[PDB]
């Protein structure tokens, strides 16, 4: 279903208790730069259980409003989300900072992080994969990635890499490897091939799904049926050694690798690769931090319209945006504004866009 609303108290730049939203299918967070737009994405992934290490602070208490000044506003900070689902009633997830401890609740039923997670895990939300978010600059980091970097990118998300060095130690065990030696060399083959498959499968459980969707996604982003994307490995036997080539045909253009496309074309394929990644094990809502910073005048409307369409079909779209061309296709705006204080103080406004007509 969808993230219905967000409630926060004293989280990062957001002082006091505020309601954020309620959210619709396509909602855009806007505001002046540096006022705490990203911090709102932190609050979401905080309440979905993110490790303190991945929320841009050193210690958990630093998440509490005012810690950057040495003046934390309280001993107690929290974020909660109301998840709405068709046929079910609303459930409430909340995460609370109490001194140095995190405390988690579901409809006030206190739980441990484990039970908190597996309940979010069955809604389609993987705090390990971070399937529900896209960090500022992700697109252009993708767009610059070479085939071996692309393989690496698949390896970490698929958890392929965890077994990658116990693979290296048993391949090292086999290169070095009178009949009592033939039988131990037989244990080498078994011990290696067992790891060759473990890693092979982890990689392919993930990569093969992305590869069949990327083309239909590249078509929809282009808004042109003459577009084609291709994702395949340089080592179909052992994909996690070589690279992942990425071939595209841009509309009214010739077939060629993604790297040789023009900047405007590179980013579109990079979005296609991105959405195809999140096409693997997809989240009910999708959170994009300033995806539109990479975009230029031509294709800004094309992805705004692709997201506008996916919001009523495939997932709730919660998008931080800095370009009026993108965020004016939203159903609603959450405008962030700053008050004056020792540190920055964020507060939100809510604007309905459906009350007004599209532009000429």
């Amino acid at each position: 279903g969808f993230l219905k609303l967000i409630e926060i108290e004293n989280f990062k730049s957001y002082k006091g208790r505020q309601i954020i939203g309620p959210f619709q299918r396509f909602t855009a967070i806007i505001g002046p730069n540096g006022s705490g737009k990203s911090n709102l994405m932190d609050a979401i992934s905080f309440v979905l259980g993110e490790k303190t290490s991945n929320l841009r602070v050193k210690t958990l208490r630093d998440l509490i409003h005012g810690a950057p000044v040495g003046k934390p506003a309280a001993n107690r900070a929290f974020v909660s989300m109301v998840y709405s689902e068709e046929g079910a009633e609303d459930r409430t997830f909340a995460r609370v900072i109490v001194g140095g401890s995190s405390e988690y609740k579901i409809n006030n039923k206190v739980v441990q992080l484990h039970e908190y997670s597996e309940e979010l895990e069955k809604l389609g939300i993987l705090i390990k994969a971070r399937n529900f978010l896209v960090f500022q600059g992700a697109v252009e980091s993708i767009a610059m990635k070479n085939p071996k970097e692309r393989t690496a990118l698949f390896e970490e998300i698929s958890r392929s890499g965890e077994l990658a060095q116990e693979y290296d130690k048993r391949k090292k065990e086999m290169v070095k490897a009178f009949e009592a030696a033939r039988k131990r060399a037989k244990k080498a083959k078994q011990a290696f091939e067992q790891i060759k498959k473990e890693r092979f499968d982890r990689f392919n459980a993930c990569f093969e799904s992305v590869a069949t969707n990327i083309d239909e996604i590249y078509k929809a982003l282009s808004r042109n049926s003459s577009a084609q994307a291709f994702l395949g490995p340089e080592n179909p036997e052992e994909p996690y050694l070589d690279g992942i080539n990425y071939n595209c045909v841009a509309p009214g253009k010739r077939f060629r690798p993604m790297d040789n496309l023009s900047g405007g074309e590179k980013t579109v394929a990079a979005l296609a690769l991105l959405f195809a990644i999140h096409s693997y094990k997809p989240a009910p809502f999708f959170v994009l931090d300033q995806i539109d910073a990479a975009l230029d005048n031509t294709n800004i409307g094309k992805v705004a319209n692709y997201i506008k369409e996916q919001s009523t079909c495939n997932f709730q779209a919660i998008v931080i945006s800095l370009k009026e061309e993108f965020y004016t296709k939203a159903e609603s705006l959450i405008g962030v504004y700053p008050e004056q204080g020792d540190c920055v103080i964020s507060k939100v406004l809510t604007f309905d866009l459906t009350k007004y007509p599209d532009a000429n």
Partner: protein
């Protein structure tokens, strides 16, 4: 702001506009509150947004 100079309704400033013009007015409430040129208030989510002149005057 200049024409805007006693309290102001956002939903009235957006009478008869299209999306890009209303989003523009909204976005300008944010920047004016940032620039202290106004204060503002909103009762509940998606209600009218109301601006009274702010500590840095007109």
């Amino acid at each position: 702001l200049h024409g805007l100079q006693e309290s102001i309704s956002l939903l009235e400033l957006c009478r008869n506009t299209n999306r890009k013009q209303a989003a523009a007015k909204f976005y300008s409430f944010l920047v004016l509150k940032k620039q202290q040129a106004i204060e503002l208030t909103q009762e509940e989510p998606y209600s009218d947004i109301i601006a009274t002149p702010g500590p840095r005057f007109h």
